[PDB]
């Protein structure tokens, strides 16, 4: 890490002297950059703050290394694209000691090989975990998103309510907020399908709130369609206009797969 | 940091045990022992929390948060007091003046303040959030030639992570911003360069907002290169703003369209 600090600091034409204070001497900083000494994370954060770099930014330039969970996701990712049932199968044996992860691997794997599904008991251990969490992070959001097909609708709806009211984001990083918005829309789709208009109404209000003062045009475009679909299912002719506008957006942006997929929904349900 | 670790762990119903020793884990949490970032990252990893996420739960961030609060209120007196408070910080106060300018036109950074900032941006080997936000907010006070040179430096030497694409998204927006001025000023070599960079940045992303503004601005390019279909592209981008109820973007680009087309 000292190597990376050195590179970033020199890269900003900043002296070691200007970084030194009562917490770390010039000597301690040099010894750290050279790897002769280690410093505390807190003292590193102080240095970074002086360089106007936050520790999450520092970590990504230090190396392409990622967490266990992101490593899991990356593996699963490329296998799902290539339809390789085979190595998802022993990816699943590789993770057997990790209950929520393997439950999630089974959920994903079922989308290309339905013979494997998480058991009701496995899913229930996961939903119990999810209900038990006080703040939803990337982990809980991704677990819920990828296991949703195996959660009963009412538990899914209740889990969604928990997630939208308990996720964490900051002004500098809306990664989790964008995900929460996408999964809320996903629940809204199911709620409309099952004609739970109580649940639909709640979700529409939440989604509108989540999209306020944001860019997020992909979610706004999908929400234009889905809300229009909700409107249609309750006799507003405008709903079809909304859906046709969303189709045009996909079309205009050259998003052919999305265009095709939503136009298929339109021709079927409308 | 020991405090924030505790909360994150415990709000997951995770025991100290099943996570260093129980003692030192416990001991870091109570803010008694300092641990390395290496061991902190290891702990977060065990907790299935990213460092990006951990941070989300910092001088520059504090400044931005205050700016955001006052600007949203359009509160000129409060932004002037913020400017006072940061006057001894050169790039930060220049940026505050640039932002203030948009709601109080009498306030502007001086040529010399802007030059110190662009000298600094030019000197940085790798662009991060700080540099990107400074450029983006000070751009209306930077002459086009300097703006293009810095944009080229930024595009070719910024960093981002797969987990947090914040920087990549901002760089895309600022590249498009530069592109529309390059086309205004008929730097078509510049425009050609930026178009390739933007197309690369957009590849395998959603980023519908950037794609919508790019559809308009690339359409603008096409119109100036003699392709009449560019008009179609620009009108379609406007329709997208309209359909999504994006008033500001719609009326602003419609304005640009009426003057240029």
């Amino acid at each position: 890490l000292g190597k990376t600090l050195r590179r970033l600091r020199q890269g900003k034409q900043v002296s070691i002297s200007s970084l030194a204070d009562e917490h770390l001497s010039k000597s301690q900083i040099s010894r750290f950059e050279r790897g002769e000494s280690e410093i505390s994370c807190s003292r590193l954060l102080n240095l970074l703050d002086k360089l106007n770099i936050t520790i999450d930014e520092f970590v990504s330039t230090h190396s392409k290394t990622h967490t266990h969970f992101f490593t899991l996701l990356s593996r699963v990712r490329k296998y799902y694209a290539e339809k390789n049932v085979a190595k998802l199968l022993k990816l699943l044996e590789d993770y057997a000691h990790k209950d929520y992860e393997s439950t999630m691997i089974k959920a994903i794997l079922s989308s290309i090989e339905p013979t494997v599904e998480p058991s009701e008991e496995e899913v229930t251990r996961l939903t119990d975990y999810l209900f038990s969490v006080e703040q939803w992070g990337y982990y809980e959001i991704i677990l819920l998103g990828n296991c949703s097909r195996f959660i009963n609708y009412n538990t899914l709806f209740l889990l969604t309510k928990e997630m939208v009211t308990s996720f964490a984001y900051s002004e500098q990083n809306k990664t989790n907020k964008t995900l929460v918005t996408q999964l809320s829309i996903n629940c809204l789709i199911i709620s409309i399908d099952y004609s739970y208009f109580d649940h639909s109404h709640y979700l529409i209000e939440k989604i509108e709130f989540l999209l306020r003062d944001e860019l997020n045009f992909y979610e706004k475009t999908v929400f234009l369609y889905v809300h229009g679909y909700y409107k249609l299912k309750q006799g507003q002719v405008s709903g079809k206009d909304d859906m046709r506008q969303a189709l045009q957006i996909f079309k205009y942006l050259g998003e052919d797969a999305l265009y095709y997929s939503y136009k298929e929904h339109y021709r079927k349900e409308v | 940091l020991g405090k924030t670790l505790r909360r994150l762990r415990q709000g997951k119903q995770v025991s100290i045990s099943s996570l260093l020793s129980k003692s030192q884990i416990s001991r870091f949490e109570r803010g008694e022992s300092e641990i390395s970032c290496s061991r902190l990252l290891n702990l977060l990893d065990k907790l299935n929390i990213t460092i990006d996420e951990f941070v989300s739960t910092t001088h520059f961030f504090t400044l931005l948060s205050r700016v955001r609060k006052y600007y949203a209120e359009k509160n000129v007196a409060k932004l002037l007091k913020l400017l006072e408070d940061y006057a001894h910080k050169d790039y930060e106060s220049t940026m505050i003046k640039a932002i203030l300018s948009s709601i109080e036109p009498t306030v502007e950074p001086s040529e010399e303040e802007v030059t110190r900032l662009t000298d600094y941006l030019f000197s940085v080997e790798q662009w991060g959030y700080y540099e990107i936000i400074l450029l983006g907010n000070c751009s209306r006070f930077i002459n086009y030639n300097t703006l293009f040179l810095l944009t080229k430096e930024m595009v070719t030497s910024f960093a981002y992570s797969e987990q947090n694409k914040t920087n990549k998204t901002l760089v895309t927006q600022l590249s498009i911003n530069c592109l529309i001025i390059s086309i205004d000023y008929s730097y078509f070599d510049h425009s050609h360069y930026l178009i390739e960079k933007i197309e690369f940045l957009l590849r395998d992303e959603l980023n519908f907002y950037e794609k919508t503004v790019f559809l308009y601005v690339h359409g603008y390019y096409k119109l100036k290169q003699g392709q009449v279909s560019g008009k179609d592209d620009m009108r379609q981008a406007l329709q997208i703003f309209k359909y999504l109820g994006e008033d500001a973007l719609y009326y602003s680009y419609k304005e640009h369209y009426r003057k240029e087309v």
């Binding site: 990712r77 991704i142 990828n146 995900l179 996408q182 999964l183 797969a257 999305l258 | 395998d204």
Partner: peptide, 11 residues
């Protein structure tokens, strides 16, 4: 990458 829909998050 693209979510159409869930789908693989985040694929």
């Amino acid at each position: 990458x693209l979510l159409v829909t869930a789908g693989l998050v985040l694929a």
